[PDB]
Amino acid sequence: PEFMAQLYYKKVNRDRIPLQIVRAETELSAEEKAFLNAVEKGDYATVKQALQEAEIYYNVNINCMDPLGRSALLIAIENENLEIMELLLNHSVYVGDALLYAIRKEVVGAVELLLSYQFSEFTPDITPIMLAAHTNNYEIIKLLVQKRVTIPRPHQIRCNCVECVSSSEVDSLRHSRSRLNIYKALASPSLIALSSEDPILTAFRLGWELKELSKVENEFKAEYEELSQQCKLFAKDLLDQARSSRELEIILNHRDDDLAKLKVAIKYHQKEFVAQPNCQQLLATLWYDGFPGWRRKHWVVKLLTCMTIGFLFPMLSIAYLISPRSNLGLFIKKPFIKFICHTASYLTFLFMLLLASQLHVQGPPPTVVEWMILPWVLGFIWGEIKEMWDGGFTEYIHDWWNLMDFAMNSLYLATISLKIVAYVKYNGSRPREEWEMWHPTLIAEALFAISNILSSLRLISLFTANSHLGPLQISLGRMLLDILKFLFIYCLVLLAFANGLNQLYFYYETRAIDEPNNCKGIRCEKQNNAFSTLFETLQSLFWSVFGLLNLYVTNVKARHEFTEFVGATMFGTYNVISLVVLLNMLIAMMNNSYQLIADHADIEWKFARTKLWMSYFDEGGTLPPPFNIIPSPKNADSLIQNQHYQEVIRNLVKRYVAAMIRNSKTHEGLTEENFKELKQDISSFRYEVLDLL
Amino acid sequence: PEFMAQLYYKKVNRDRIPLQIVRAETELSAEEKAFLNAVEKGDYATVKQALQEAEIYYNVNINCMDPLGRSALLIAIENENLEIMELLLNHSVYVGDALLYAIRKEVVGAVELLLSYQFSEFTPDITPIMLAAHTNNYEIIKLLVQKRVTIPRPHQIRCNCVECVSSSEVDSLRHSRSRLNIYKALASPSLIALSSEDPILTAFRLGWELKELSKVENEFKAEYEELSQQCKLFAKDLLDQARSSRELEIILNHRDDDLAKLKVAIKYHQKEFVAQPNCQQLLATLWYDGFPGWRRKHWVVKLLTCMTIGFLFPMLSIAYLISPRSNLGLFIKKPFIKFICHTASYLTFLFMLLLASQLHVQGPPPTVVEWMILPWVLGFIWGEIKEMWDGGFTEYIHDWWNLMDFAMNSLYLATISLKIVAYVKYNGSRPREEWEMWHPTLIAEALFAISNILSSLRLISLFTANSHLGPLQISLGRMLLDILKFLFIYCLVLLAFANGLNQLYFYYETRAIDEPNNCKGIRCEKQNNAFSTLFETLQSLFWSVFGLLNLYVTNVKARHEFTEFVGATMFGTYNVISLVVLLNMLIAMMNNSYQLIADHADIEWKFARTKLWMSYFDEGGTLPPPFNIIPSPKNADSLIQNQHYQEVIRNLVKRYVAAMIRNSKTHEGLTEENFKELKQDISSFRYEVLDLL
Ligand SMILES: CCCCCCCCCCCCCCCCCCCC(=O)O[C@H](COC(=O)CCCCCCCCCCCCCC)COP(=O)(O)OCCN
Ligand SMILES: CCCCCCCCCCCCCCCCCCCC(=O)O[C@H](COC(=O)CCCCCCCCCCCCCC)COP(=O)(O)OCCN
Ligand SMILES: CC(C)CCC[C@@H](C)[C@H]1CC[C@H]2[C@@H]3CC=C4C[C@@H](OC(=O)CCC(=O)O)CC[C@]4(C)[C@H]3CC[C@]12C
Ligand SMILES: CC(C)CCC[C@@H](C)[C@H]1CC[C@H]2[C@@H]3CC=C4C[C@@H](OC(=O)CCC(=O)O)CC[C@]4(C)[C@H]3CC[C@]12C
Numbered sequence A, B: 001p002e003f004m005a006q007l008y009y010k011k012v013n014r015d016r017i018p019l020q021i022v023r024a025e026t027e028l029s030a031e032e033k034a035f036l037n038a039v040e041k042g043d044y045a046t047v048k049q050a051l052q053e054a055e056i057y058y059n060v061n062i063n064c065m066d067p068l069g070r071s072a073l074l075i076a077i078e079n080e081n082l083e084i085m086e087l088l089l090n091h092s093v094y095v096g097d098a099l100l101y102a103i104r105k106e107v108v109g110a111v112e113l114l115l116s117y118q119f120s121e122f123t124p125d126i127t128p129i130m131l132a133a134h135t136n137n138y139e140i141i142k143l144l145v146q147k148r149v150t151i152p153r154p155h156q157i158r159c160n161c162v163e164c165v166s167s168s169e170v171d172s173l174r175h176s177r178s179r180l181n182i183y184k185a186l187a188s189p190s191l192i193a194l195s196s197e198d199p200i201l202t203a204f205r206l207g208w209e210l211k212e213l214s215k216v217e218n219e220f221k222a223e224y225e226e227l228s229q230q231c232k233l234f235a236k237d238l239l240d241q242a243r244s245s246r247e248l249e250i251i252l253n254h255r256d257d258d259l260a261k262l263k264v265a266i267k268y269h270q271k272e273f274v275a276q277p278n279c280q281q282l283l284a285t286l287w288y289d290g291f292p293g294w295r296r297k298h299w300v301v302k303l304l305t306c307m308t309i310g311f312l313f314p315m316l317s318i319a320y321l322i323s324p325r326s327n328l329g330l331f332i333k334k335p336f337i338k339f340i341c342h343t344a345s346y347l348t349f350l351f352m353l354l355l356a357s358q359l360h361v362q363g364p365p366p367t368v369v370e371w372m373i374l375p376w377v378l379g380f381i382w383g384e385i386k387e388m389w390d391g392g393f394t395e396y397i398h399d400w401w402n403l404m405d406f407a408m409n410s411l412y413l414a415t416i417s418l419k420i421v422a423y424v425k426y427n428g429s430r431p432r433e434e435w436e437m438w439h440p441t442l443i444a445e446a447l448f449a450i451s452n453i454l455s456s457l458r459l460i461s462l463f464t465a466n467s468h469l470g471p472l473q474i475s476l477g478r479m480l481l482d483i484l485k486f487l488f489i490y491c492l493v494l495l496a497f498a499n500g501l502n503q504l505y506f507y508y509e510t511r512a513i514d515e516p517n518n519c520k521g522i523r524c525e526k527q528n529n530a531f532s533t534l535f536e537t538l539q540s541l542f543w544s545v546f547g548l549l550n551l552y553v554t555n556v557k558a559r560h561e562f563t564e565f566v567g568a569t570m571f572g573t574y575n576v577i578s579l580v581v582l583l584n585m586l587i588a589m590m591n592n593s594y595q596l597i598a599d600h601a602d603i604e605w606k607f608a609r610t611k612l613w614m615s616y617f618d619e620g621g622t623l624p625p626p627f628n629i630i631p632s633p634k635n636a637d638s639l640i641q642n643q644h645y646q647e648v649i650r651n652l653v654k655r656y657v658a659a660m661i662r663n664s665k666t667h668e669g670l671t672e673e674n675f676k677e678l679k680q681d682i683s684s685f686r687y688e689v690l691d692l693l
């Protein structure tokens, strides 16, 4: 009979598997087992009797451990029996690490009892305050903080001190666990509620550094991410506890050194805090400065008002330029009026581009449409460099719409330079058919057309301000990452198959003269030389994705049936792989990404729209192009703000603690430790009655 | 060693983080802590003893607050201990806002005790009746309503009174919270069960206005949506409690001022109420008036009966026209017979359109097929204007099938007018090859063909009456919204790339004469001038989505390789972006939308089919075209209906309250407040026994 030779033992090596305690320990004796059972049942009577008997005769080890690791004190703590715990403490049982067990079980009375005076379930670095913060119990954390406890200060991510490197080399696991435990203690909402001068600010900073740690710490990434999410949720709930608009303005306008704290939240990407309904209500109130009742207005009225303000944008800009203090001078200063004016200016620029789209002069002078376009381009460039000067270099490069604006402005500058070069180096009127391939006019036209495409695509950034197009834009932005990830391997496969096809087909490259219409390449009516060169092969394989490459391009002029079949088989394999596998894989990745983002789409859109709104709150950059390039003719107070913020924060912390306790109390589902402790109370009552009677 | 300089403190600024109570409060003394612990443990003995000791010696503040905010009265309420609460009340403890805590914990005895005679967890606007309605406890709500309590009347959404605007400017957060709390109290199913003359009607109106508020209130939208859903669910459950058909007819036929209440439910879009199984059973009984056993019939029998009635539709219409009172005169009056006759008439119209589809006369007289079609068109127009006259203008424009009917009828009218114009302004027989581009006959034919397309697509509305095609039609209708949302940005990208391509390629526009077949555009065998004009560029980029635009259209006649490559690169970028990114994004959005609608697809289909059925219940509009344009030869009772409806509503409310209490009682999952109160009972029993013994 064939058997499993070795499953649990090696040297034992017939039809049975004998079982033994391989890692045998020290078993409890009869009296020790009886004493521990009496402690478990909670009868004070025989527990006390056995304690006195062991004191007198030394027959029983009162520090005996249940083979599972629990002692009499640990059992009493687990049973939440304060009387038996007091009795054991008065008999001087071993109290080592029992405070940690009491903290974890969250017995306030046990914590006070142990504060008033081997194997462990906790790592050696765990301290009572650290574990109390981990449990997030406000009572125990406060009780421990009333005594002078400290939390070791974590080092920076890029720290390279002797202590950090020595600890990492000696024990990387212990160092990582200690860092994670320290950050878990620090990120405790109850510990941030206490012991923190600015809980909101601390949460913002803690979430940011925890996200950075999750980035750097490739392992243990989920723990740091959930700690950062906990900090963000704590900040959002603190903002939720606000009960009046005055408190909200105090919170949001507070400067640690208007809406300073909201700008700090935006800097740390606290999307949940920013997307809070009250903060969004205040932001909408500031946004619709001119219209107090824009929210309750019919869509036709809103559309008519928007069109009227857009048509009136030049007059508003001129009024601001001449007299900033008037009925119309400061009208454009309103954030929504400013947004409408800027949108109208950009739409006018795009309309002028379209009109420009509406012949044999080398380097012709710019037309009236180009002359009108030029101030808009200069205004865009000046606004770009002004954003660089004001917001700084780091802030500008973070935005990708800023990258698109830089590309578009560089293309416009190149177009202007090429037009100037063509004007100054060309005077005659030569027909375009005989122009050079790299003629300056042709390159200028190409760059202008690409700039027009980019300028018209820049309108997608305005989708953020809309309730319907906003989350759509967010979804496209999120799935562009999957687009890039799939595009990497699409380009790899494209390069592989292009290399193969070109290696096969470069022997049959033909001159353009031999072609029916003197046309060489796949952009001809009769496609030819599709895989003659590597660049043409890449273009052909790209165009095969859309079916624009005909099948006869795999046929050579000679009667090489085997070579033509091999090329057609490479082409078919590329079609299969790329189209079916890669495109449908991309569809699946985008589907899953869409399901992931749909839960958080609203908060992301609100954060992006808040950024867009605060972009229009500042005094600078009010004039849209081309009016931004027109030279215009032109402590005790801190302490009281700090005191008001501190009072508001105290009220918020009290409300948050009460709400969190209420949420914990009203959570459906009881664990069996409550059942065992209820059993303990009932059994103690039964035995006490029996002793009395 | 690099450290995190400031995490919890700013000015403290080495390797540790000292912890202190930054927002320090007043700690409880020893005797106050002991008294509160005695209250928590529920021992009446030392609680009473400490109360008397504080009364005599003033050593203990009986109003001392646990640093978490709970006082002795609050702890007693949380422990559900009525004896200790009575003892505290007899000793005149502070009772402020304790009624709210008792209401929230839903202790009926505590509520009666407090009715019989700082920091808070409730907002200042919360009133006992409001919080009782929020908790949806029928007992406490009834107890508070027996005393003369009031709920502040909410203002309208578009209200612009001095009070509303002053409250919004002074405190927008408080005003919004107060409005939400008032509507939460009003939308309470238990409070609607009481205090409401017509609970069903109140629920319909409350859900409607809560949905309107969710629309207007962009923030706090989820709360208003869930309140409206709660009102709809309450109405649906009230309809569920019906136990007999007589009660159902009493409910549905009740007029507040047949099936009046069902029409009111349809007006408020109470889809769950309408899709109730008993209401649908009654609607099916009314729908199959002629056939008492249509439900239990073989599919072949149903198909044969439907075909027979459809073939017999002209005779039924003529019989109704001549003698409305006969065996066949009122047969078409039945809703299902009427539906079959109308479907047969429309199918005959479509068959005649197809026959019309089955040559050199300018403005020819209409053929026999067109002469037969004309009465159908006149009937459709007359039915449209009759729906305008009867149902009103607002009701008509809400339907989108009504918009399609308007477009189709306008196209038919334009076709008739153009045919008349061509007949009266053209007599000779000129070959069609030399006709003008805008010849009236050609435009009339084009409009007639578009009208035929619209008329044949109108059949999709009939999918609602089918069990399989109904939810499919609902799903298509739901995803058309995503179609439009994606089409917005598709058109934006299309305009951007069309602008770029036209700006690049408009220099190479060629005359049609220079083309091989005198054909200019992409609708030619050899496509050319694809990006010469903006409209042609838009058409070319549209047709590139389906692969119908060949690649050689990016080649210019001249040898401008750089320009051709730039144009081909714009074309490839447009293909990539539009097809891959945008189409697959649309696929993902439609997938997610389908998952969202699949849960509610059945209710939506039932509501739509109910609307279709009640469209055939009315006396008017019985004759289908072309028979609708043939001129035919032609209180005490309210009080008893109100009393019957009131009795039925009383029975329904009693049943609903009993069912909701049963549902609450049989919900799996106990929260830990029950565990703590069980501990309180056990501990009170233990201490009472100890005191006795
Ligand atoms: C040699 C001849 C070549 C001829 C080529 C002609 C055709 C050129 C057409 C270029 C079109 C590029 C594609 C633009 C698609 C924009 C889609 C934006 C969607 C979106 O909402 O993303 C936002 C950011 O936008 C952004 O990320 C910015 C979008 C644009 C960035 C890249 C700009 C490339 C410019 C190329 C110039 C080529 C010049 C050639 C001479 C989100 O924003 P978020 O911040 O939340 O981010 C969240 C990231 N998940
Ligand atoms: C210049 C030459 C032009 C030549 C053009 C020739 C081709 C024209 C073809 C037009 C076809 C338009 C597309 C019709 C698709 C109908 C799909 C209906 C699906 C559906 O069930 O939606 C129902 C409502 O129907 C509806 O919403 C109504 C559908 C139709 C509304 C739009 C009608 C457009 C008419 C265009 C006329 C053009 C004339 C040009 C001279 C749901 O119903 P619900 O109420 O539950 O809604 C729920 C909303 N989620
Ligand atoms: C799609 C084709 C026909 C080209 C049309 C180009 C523009 C005329 C469209 C494309 C995107 C549209 C924009 C999409 C996003 C918004 C944000 C939207 O913001 C609001 O909803 C106002 C309320 C607020 O945010 O304070 C205002 C309209 C606007 C500028 C739209 C104005 C009209 C735009 C510029
Ligand atoms: C698909 C091609 C062959 C063109 C055929 C056109 C018509 C002959 C088809 C297309 C849609 C069909 C309709 C789809 C929906 C319905 C609702 C359906 O309603 C029922 O199930 C009867 C029970 C009831 O609702 O009371 C009756 C058949 C009918 C009119 C179908 C009749 C036959 C129709 C008109």
Ligand SMILES: CC(C)[C@@]12C[C@@H](OC(=O)CO)[C@@](C)(O1)[C@@H]1CC[C@@H](C)[C@H]1[C@@H]2OC(=O)/C=C/c1ccccc1
Binding pocket: A487, A490, A538, A539, A540, A542, A543, A545, A583, B565, B568, B569, B572, B573, B576, B580
């Ligand atoms: C759009 C532009 C960047 C393209 C489009 C080509 O232009 C032409 O071919 C004119 O002759 C060109 C020159 O530049 C390159 C040749 C090979 C390939 C890398 C092409 C590039 O295309 C993609 O980068 C990826 C496309 C893709 C993505 C997802 C699914 C399927 C395809």
Ligand SMILES: CC(C)[C@@]12C[C@@H](OC(=O)CO)[C@@](C)(O1)[C@@H]1CC[C@@H](C)[C@H]1[C@@H]2OC(=O)/C=C/c1ccccc1
Binding pocket: A565, A568, A569, A572, A573, A576, A580
């Ligand atoms: C790629 C290569 C293995 C192919 C591609 C053909 O080469 C050509 O035709 C040149 O003339 C060839 C010879 O060898 C076979 C002919 C019939 C079929 C089996 C083809 C094979 O293709 C697939 O095995 C499956 C393709 C597929 C997969 C998913 C969805 C759709 C299609």
Ligand SMILES: [Ca+2]
Binding pocket: A384, A387, A401, A402, A405
């Ligand atoms: Ca910019």
Ligand SMILES: [Ca+2]
Binding pocket: B384, B387, B401, B402, B405
């Ligand atoms: Ca109609």
Ligand SMILES: [Zn+2]
Binding pocket: A155, A156, A159, A160, A161, A162, A163, A164, A165, B001, B002
């Ligand atoms: Zn270090």
Ligand SMILES: [Zn+2]
Binding pocket: B155, B156, B159, B160, B161, B162, B163, B164, B165
């Ligand atoms: Zn008002």
